[PDB]
Amino acid sequence: ERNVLIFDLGGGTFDVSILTIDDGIFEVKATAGDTHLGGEDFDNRLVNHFVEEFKRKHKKDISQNKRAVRRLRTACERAKRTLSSSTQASLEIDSLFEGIDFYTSITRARFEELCSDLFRSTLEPVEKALRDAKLDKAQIHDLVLVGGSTRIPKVQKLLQDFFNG
């Protein structure tokens, strides 16, 4: 009897699934998840932090220029990833708004603060699939991660801490 937990955090949706593999039969035993949690979500937490930071340093709100907000977000996605190896990253966005060249930094720590809540809400689905599978965390023999956004250190740590190691 083997319980495998599949934790899939992608760019738009978060899906968890408890799958048992016994007697050579793979069977999905429970499913949960949140459809409003994904990498896209984390990105925007950084986008907001900077749009606000940009109001402070340049006395201007870039919110209504969507072409600019998009660049900001694409840039942020790049930083969020760098922040999975490095403990901090920097952003250089030439002429981001009204010809202003934008320069900033963010620490892995800061990234996490801005995403605190989002991070902790990934367990909800895990716990639910555990009830719906009439299982206890202590039984999950394996934990496999699938989905680009399962590399975020803080994600694997919250997950790992849950199963106490």
């Binding site: 006395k59 998009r70 694409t74 990833r81 250089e92 930094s105």
Partner: protein, 264 residues
């Protein structure tokens, strides 16, 4: 996406070799058509995925070798720009651009191009390649990077000054082991030279670096106490200019932390 088809469309445009010694309205035309395809590629490449797919399509190869080295400044900086956009904070695309030996073409351009814009987009590309990118920082140091850099700060080109200060601050954060080779290179004096310029945003980065060079590093603290520089009188006159200002907060934190560890 229609993006892949569209950039493959730009690529098509960029691949067609230069006209057979065509005429005026055939050169200035053929060019605008590339300036355009290169800009469009930049906008598309701002997104990791697109830039990724750009590399798969041998795009990065045509860029580094052929265009960076174009004849028209216009084609050059736009190419640097694109090279930068794709790489920024993405290890895999950095590694590939690094592997095609761009840093050497970039650094060359930075250090001696007739168009200040090319030099600026080059520095931009360089930064996008060595920041938080270990293999790139080494190919950089080995290429006398800190010297191509400092010479830029010394250039009478603002954007070069800000861009240089910005990158040094970054580099100093993740690699304090270089503090020494930097001080002995006289970067403290140089950084201080940029402080005495008309205050503007980038100063946060100058003082930002300066602040790292001094952090647990007496050689650096010694560099700042140097009488000639008059760094103290300077930082107190600044510490006072950045007061009720929120748009300069980080400079004031830096400007103060400096005073606090070099004058007490």
């Amino acid at each position: 996406r229609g993006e892949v088809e569209q950039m493959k469309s730009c690529l098509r445009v960029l691949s067609q070799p230069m006209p057979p010694t065509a005429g005026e309205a055939e050169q200035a035309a053929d060019q605008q058509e590339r300036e355009g395809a290169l800009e469009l590629l930049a906008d598309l490449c701002e997104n990791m995925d697109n830039a990724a797919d750009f590399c798969q399509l041998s795009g990065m190869h045509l860029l580094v070798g052929r265009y960076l080295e174009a004849g028209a400044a216009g084609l050059r900086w736009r190419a640097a720009q694109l090279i930068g956009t794709c790489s920024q904070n993405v290890a895999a695309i950095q590694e590939q651009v690094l592997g095609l030996g761009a840093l050497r073409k970039l650094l060359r351009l930075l250090d001696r191009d007739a168009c200040d814009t090319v030099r600026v987009k080059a520095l931009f590309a360089i930064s996008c390649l060595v920041r938080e990118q270990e293999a790139g920082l080494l190919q950089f140091l080995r290429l006398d990077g800190f010297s191509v850099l400092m010479r830029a700060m010394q250039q009478q080109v603002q954007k070069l000054k800000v861009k240089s200060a910005f990158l040094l601050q970054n580099l100093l954060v993740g690699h304090p082991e270089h503090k020494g080779t930097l001080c002995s290179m006289g970067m403290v004096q140089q950084l201080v030279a940029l402080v005495r310029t008309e205050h503007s945003p980038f100063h946060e980065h100058v003082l930002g670096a300066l602040c790292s060079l001094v952090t647990d590093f007496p050689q650096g603290v010694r560099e700042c106490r140097e009488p000639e520089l008059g760094l103290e009188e300077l930082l107190r006159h600044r510490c006072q200019l950045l007061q009720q200002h929120e748009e300069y907060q980080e400079e004031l934190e830096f400007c103060e932390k400096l005073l606090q560890t070099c004058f007490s």
